[PDB]
Amino acid sequence: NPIHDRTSDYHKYLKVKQGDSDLFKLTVSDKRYIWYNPDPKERDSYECGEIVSETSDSFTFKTVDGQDRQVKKDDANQRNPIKFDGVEDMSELSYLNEPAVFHNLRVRYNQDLIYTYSGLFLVAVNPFKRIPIYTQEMVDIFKGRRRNEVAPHIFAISDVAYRSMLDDRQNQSLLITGESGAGKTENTKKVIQYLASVAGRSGVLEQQILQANPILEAFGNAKTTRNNNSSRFGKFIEIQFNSAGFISGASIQSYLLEKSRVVFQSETERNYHIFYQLLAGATAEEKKALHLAGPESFNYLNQSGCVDIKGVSDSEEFKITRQAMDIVGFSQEEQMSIFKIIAGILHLGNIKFEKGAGEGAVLKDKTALNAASTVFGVNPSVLEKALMEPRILAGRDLVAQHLNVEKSSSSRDALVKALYGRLFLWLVKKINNVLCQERKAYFIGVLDISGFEIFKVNSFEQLCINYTNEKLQQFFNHHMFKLEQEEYLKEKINWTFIDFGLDSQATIDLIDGRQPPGILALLDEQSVFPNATDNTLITKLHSHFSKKNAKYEEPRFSKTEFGVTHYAGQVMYEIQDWLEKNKDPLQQDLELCFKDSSDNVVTKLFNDPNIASRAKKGANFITVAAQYKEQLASLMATLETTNPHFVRCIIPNNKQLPAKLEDKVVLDQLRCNGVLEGIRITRKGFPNRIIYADFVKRYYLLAPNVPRDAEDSQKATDAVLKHLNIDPEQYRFGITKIFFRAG
Ligand SMILES: COC(=O)c1cc2c3c(c(N)cc(N)c3n1)N(C)C2=O
Numbered sequence: 226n227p228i229h230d231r232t233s234d235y236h237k238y239l240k241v242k243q244g245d246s247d248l249f250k251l252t253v254s255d256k257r258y259i260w261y262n263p264d265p266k267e268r269d270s271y272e273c274g275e276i277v278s279e280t281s282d283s284f285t286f287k288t289v290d291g292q293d294r295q296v297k298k299d300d301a302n303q304r305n306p307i308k309f310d311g312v313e314d315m316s317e318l319s320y321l322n323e324p325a326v327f328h329n330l331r332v333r334y335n336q337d338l339i340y341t342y343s344g345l346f347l348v349a350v351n352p353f354k355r356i357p358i359y360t361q362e363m364v365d366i367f368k369g370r371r372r373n374e375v376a377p378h379i380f381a382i383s384d385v386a387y388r389s390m391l392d393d394r395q396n397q398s399l400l401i402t403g404e405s406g407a408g409k410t411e412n413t414k415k416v417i418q419y420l421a422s423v424a425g426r427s428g429v430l431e432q433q434i435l436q437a438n439p440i441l442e443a444f445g446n447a448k449t450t451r452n453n454n455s456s457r458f459g460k461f462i463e464i465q466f467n468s469a470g471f472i473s474g475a476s477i478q479s480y481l482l483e484k485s486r487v488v489f490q491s492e493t494e495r496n497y498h499i500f501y502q503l504l505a506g507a508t509a510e511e512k513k514a515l516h517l518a519g520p521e522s523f524n525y526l527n528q529s530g531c532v533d534i535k536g537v538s539d540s541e542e543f544k545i546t547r548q549a550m551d552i553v554g555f556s557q558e559e560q561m562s563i564f565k566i567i568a569g570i571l572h573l574g575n576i577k578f579e580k581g582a583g584e585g586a587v588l589k590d591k592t593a594l595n596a597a598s599t600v601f602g603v604n605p606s607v608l609e610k611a612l613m614e615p616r617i618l619a620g621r622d623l624v625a626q627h628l629n630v631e632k633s634s635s636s637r638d639a640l641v642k643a644l645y646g647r648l649f650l651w652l653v654k655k656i657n658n659v660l661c662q663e664r665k666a667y668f669i670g671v672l673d674i675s676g677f678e679i680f681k682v683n684s685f686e687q688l689c690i691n692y693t694n695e696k697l698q699q700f701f702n703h704h705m706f707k708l709e710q711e712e713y714l715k716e717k718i719n720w721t722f723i724d725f726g727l728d729s730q731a732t733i734d735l736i737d738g739r740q741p742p743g744i745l746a747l748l749d750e751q752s753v754f755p756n757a758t759d760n761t762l763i764t765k766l767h768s769h770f771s772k773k774n775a776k777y778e779e780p781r782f783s784k785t786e787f788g789v790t791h792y793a794g795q796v797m798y799e800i801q802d803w804l805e806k807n808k809d810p811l812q813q814d815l816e817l818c819f820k821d822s823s824d825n826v827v828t829k830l831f832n833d834p835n836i837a838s839r840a841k842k843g844a845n846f847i848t849v850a851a852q853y854k855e856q857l858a859s860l861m862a863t864l865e866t867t868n869p870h871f872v873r874c875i876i877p878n879n880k881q882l883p884a885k886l887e888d889k890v891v892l893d894q895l896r897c898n899g900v901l902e903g904i905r906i907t908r909k910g911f912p913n914r915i916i917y918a919d920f921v922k923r924y925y926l927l928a929p930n931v932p933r934d935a936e937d938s939q940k941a942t943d944a945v946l947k948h949l950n951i952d953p954e955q956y957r958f959g960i961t962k963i964f965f966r967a968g
C-alpha cells in the first residue's frame with residue numbers, strides 16, 4: 226500500500242518530507258517564537274522573533290537583527306510549535322492567526338504540496354508548474370479512502386462529494402472559488418477526471434465529457450494580462466449519475482461570454498484562442514479556401530501587440546481541438562462551417578467604412594465584405610445595405626437609416642459579437658445533446674466561473690464577473706457561518722452566536738437590489754429610456770448612491786467612474802458604453818441577411834429560437850443585466866438544493882511564476898475568502914452531527930445493552946458513548962441530534 230510505502234510517488238509528492246535529526250532537536254526545543262512585522266507599515270511581511278521574556282500582559286522578543294521589542298499578549302501572533310509545520314488540516318493549529326496560517330501554507334508549498342485542508346473545505350495554491358499528482362495511479366489511490374486516511378487533494382474532496390451523494394442520496398456541488406488565475410479551471414478539470422474515473426463504465430461517454438473542454442476553452446478562453454488561459458465564460462457542469470452511482474451523463478450550463486473581446490483586446494492580451502489556432506493550424510488550402518493570412522493581417526488580432534503565448538503551439542492546439550470535435554461527434558461539414566464562421570468574423574473585422582459625400586458611411590473596398598459573404602454564404606449587397614443603411618420603423622413608417630462611419634463600425638461589431646456568441650451557444654448545445662442521453666438520478670455540479678478580476682479600466686463585464694464572485698463568496702459565508710449556527714441554535718446546543726464579520730449582502734444589494742433600485746435596476750431603467758446616455762446613467766447612479774450607500778463611491782478624480790467595494794476590494798468602473806452593452810442591439814436587417822445564409826450552421830444561428838430569439842419584458846427586450854441576473858438567481862437556487870463542497874484556489878503572485886509565494890497577495894486572499902473564520906467555526910463549533918436514532922447502525926455498543934433498536938434515543942446514546950469516557954466537552958445534545966467537535 227503506497228500510502229504506507231515512503232518510497233512511493235504518493236509519499237514523495239503528496240506527503241511532507243521526513244525531517245532530520247537536527248530538525249528533531251529543534252522540534253523538542255522549549256523555545257518559543259512570535260510572528261512579527263519588522264516594518265509595522267507592512268502588516269503582511271513577517272519574520273520570526275524569539276520570545277525572551279513575558280509580563281502578565283506582554284511578551285518581549287528578539288528580532289532577527291537582535292533588537293528587543295515588546296508587544297501586548299492580546300496583539301501577539303504566536304508561532305505554532307514547529308511540529309505543526311506542514312500540517313494537512315489547519316483546524317489542528319494551536320494558534321489560529323494570519324501569519325501562522327500563511328506559514329503553514331508556505332511550508333507545504335515550498336515542498337510542492339499545493340493542497341491543504343482548513344477544516345471542512347480545501348485550499349489550493351496555484352503552483353504555476355506541473356506536479357505529477359494527477360496520474361491514474363494517484364486517482365486510484367484516492368478511491369475508497371476516508372478523508373483522514375490520505376493527503377489533501379482535489380481527488381479527495383471529489384471522492385467525499387461522490388460518497389456523500391451515495392450515502393445521503395442527495396445532490397452535491399463542488400464550488401471552486403478564486404480570483405482570475407487562481408486555478409479554478411484546472412481544478413474543475415481534475416474533479417471531472419476523478420468522477421469520470423471512479424464512477425465510469427459504452428465507455429465513450431466519459432471520454433466525450435472530458436473532450437468537451439478543449440472545445441470550450443478554444444472558443445471561450447483567452448489570454449488576459451492576468452491569465453494566459455483565462456475563462457471568459459462561467460460554467461456549471463452537472464455530472465449526472467444513475468441510482469446505482471454510475472455516470473449516466475453530463476450537462477453544461479454556460480454563463481456570460483465576454484463577446485466584446487472578439488472585437489477588442491487590450492495591450493498584450495489575446496482574442497479567443499481559436500482564432501490563432503485556426504490561422505496557425507489550418508491546412509495549406511484550408512487557408513486558400515477561407516481567404517486567411519496570418520494574425521497580423523486581421524484587425525481583430527493585430528491590435529493588442531500579442532499573437533503568442535509562451536509554451537503554447539496554437540497549431541498543435543488546433544489539432545487537439547479538432548480531435549475533440551471528432552470524439553464529441555461534430556461532423557466534418559459541421560466543423561468546416563464552424564471554421565467558416567470564425568474566418569468570416571475575421572473578414573468582417575477587416576471591413577473599413579469611410580465617410581461618403583455626406584455624413585453617411587461608404588465602403589470603397591469590398592474585398593473583406595466579399596470574403597465574409599462568400600464564407601458565410603450570404604448576399605454581399607444585402608449585407609452592405611444592412612450594415613450602412615439598415616431599415617427601421619418610425620411609428621409605422623419604414624425608414625432607411627444612413628449610418629455614419631462610427632455607427633457602421635459599431636453595427637458590424639454587433640454583428641460579429643452576435644455571430645460569435647450564437648456560435649458559442651450552439652457549440653455548447655451540440656455538446657449537451659451528445660452528453661445528455663438519460664434522465665439522471667443524481668448530480669454533482671461543478672462550478673467554474675470567471676474569477677474576480679481588476680484592470681486599469683473596468684467595464685460592465687467586470688461588474689458582472691465581480692458580482693458573480695461576490696455572490697459566490699456570500700454563498701460560502703451563508704453555509705459556513707449563518708446556516709451552521711442556525712442549526713446550533715435550533716438544536717438549542719447552548720451556543721452564543723458569533724459575528725464572524727463577513728457579510729457581502731450590502732454589496733450584493735447595491736448591485737442587484739429592487740427596492741430601492743440597485744445599480745443594475747437603474748441601468749435597466751436608463752436602458753429603456755429614449756433620451757438616456759452614459760452620462761445620464763452615471764449621474765443617476767451618483768444621485769442614488771453617492772454619500773448614501775456605504776459600498777459605493779462617487780470619485781472626485783473622475784466624471785465617468787464609480788467605485789464598488791467588493792469582498793475582494795474596491796473596484797472602479799468606467800461607465801462608457803454601458804447602455805449599449807446592456808441593450809445589446811443588432812439591426813433586424815442584419816438578422817434577415819443571415820437568416821438567408823446558404824450555410825446549415827449559420828441559418829441555425831439565426832433561425833433557431835433557442836439561439837436567435839430574445840425574451841421580452843413589456844415593450845422591451847430583456848436586458849443583459851436582467852437576464853444574467855435571472856440566470857444567476859437560478860444557479861443559486863439550484864446550489865441551495867445541493868450539499869456544497871468548497872475549494873478555495875489561491876494565486877501565489879501576480880506574475881504567473883512558480884516558486885514565488887507572495888505574502889501580501891496570499892494574505893489578502895485568505896482574508897477576503899474568510900479562511901481563518903472558517904477554520905475558527907470548525908474548531909469552536911460542532912462540525913459533526915447525527916439524529917438520535919440513525920446512530921445504532923454504524924457500530925453496535927459498548928454499553929449495558931442498547932442494541933440496533935431501543936425505546937430510548939437520548940439516554941440510549943448517552944450511555945453507549947459514555948463508556949469510552951471521552952470528554953462531554955467534545956459533544957452536545959440537540960432536540961434531535963448528538964453534536965461533536967472532532968469525531
Ligand atoms: C452569448 O451570445 C448570444 O447568445 C447572443 C448574442 C447576441 C444576441 C443578440 C440578439 N439581438 C439576440 C440574441 N438571442 C443574442 N444572443 N445580440 C445583439 C447579440 O450580440
Ligand SMILES: COC(=O)c1cc2c3c(c(N)cc(N)c3n1)N(C)C2=O
Nearest residue numbers: 734735738739740741742743773774
Ligand atoms: C434586496 O434589498 C434591497 O432591495 C435594497 C435595500 C436597500 C438598498 C439601499 C441602497 N442604498 C441601495 C440598494 N440597491 C438597496 N437595495 N438601502 C439603503 C437599503 O436599505
Ligand SMILES: [Mg+2]
Nearest residue numbers: 409410455456
Ligand atoms: Mg478559468
